Amino acid sequence: SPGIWQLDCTHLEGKVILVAVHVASGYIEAEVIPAETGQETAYFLLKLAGRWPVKTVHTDNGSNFTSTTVKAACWWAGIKQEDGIPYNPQSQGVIESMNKELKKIIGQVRDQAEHLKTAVQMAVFIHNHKRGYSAGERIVDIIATDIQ
Amino acid sequence: SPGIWQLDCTHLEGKVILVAVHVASGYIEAEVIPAETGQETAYFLLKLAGRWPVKTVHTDNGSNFTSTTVKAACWWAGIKQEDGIPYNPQSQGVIESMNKELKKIIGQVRDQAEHLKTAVQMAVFIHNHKRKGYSAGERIVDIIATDIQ
């Protein structure tokens, strides 16, 4: 479980928000992209895997699962690509709830940021810092425990 | 020390590579940008602070230290902005050495990536995973975990 991440793609203001969730902790990383292509997803995963020990990724849809560029990035970074099928159906609800929460935070920071990308990063910050421990605290503890 | 980061700006292929180094561990995050503006630096810090517990940042130069946008981002994120003056002069050598190492890795991945930004992220990966023995990635997690307890 310490190396398991889930991809999540949500939409806002005619733009695409790509999210990676560390399943065990609820910690996230996110980016705004023009559209969800294999290339954008692949680049996002390369960034993620350089920053955290990503062992397995549950991909968000079949197009990214199939993408040769995504497969290339997973090979390069030592990531096992898996499907994101919610065999446990409560999975979908948790993700949907997070997307709602994230959009809510984004709305709350609109007097502060001119650009959506900035608001998304503010939302990442607030999500990861929210307290009981925070998601940021949980991911560090989970990984540290795993190293030692 | 667990919350202390240093900004570092280096140049390659007529482009700018902005780097944040976690001082105690040597762990890095980096991005390619067209040029080093206050706005780009500010955005970079917002990203960083959402991902790791950034308490203090030693800024890479006076323009970013002065920048109202950088100051706004540091205020927003709860970051103490400090200067990056190497009072301990060995500081500067360590950074220069890392920049050399990073450029070397970037050169080694040029048959693999079409775009510089991709090569930089590959270099971040290799740097953070490299065993010295623990890796920088392992060190930062241990340092922060120890601090939470």
Ligand SMILES: CC(C)C[C@H](CNC(=O)Cc1c[nH]cn1)Cc1ccc2c(c1C(=O)O)OCO2
């Ligand atoms: C830290 C924030 C509180 C402020 C900081 C600067 N923005 C403003 O001051 C806009 C404003 C607020 N009230 C009236 N105008 C946000 C920011 C930082 C860096 C960026 C940005 C933005 C952005 O605005 O999206 O865009 C890409 O690089």
Ligand SMILES: CC(C)C[C@H](CNC(=O)Cc1c[nH]cn1)Cc1ccc2c(c1C(=O)O)OCO2
């Ligand atoms: C995982 C890598 C080994 C490959 C992957 C795809 N690139 C190629 O296949 C180029 C090629 C042709 N012949 C040899 N290499 C890199 C990559 C991924 C995502 C991106 C990229 C790039 C990039 O190339 O910069 O640009 C922005 O989004």
Ligand SMILES: [Cl-]
């Ligand atoms: Cl790592």
Ligand SMILES: [Cl-]
């Ligand atoms: Cl954090």
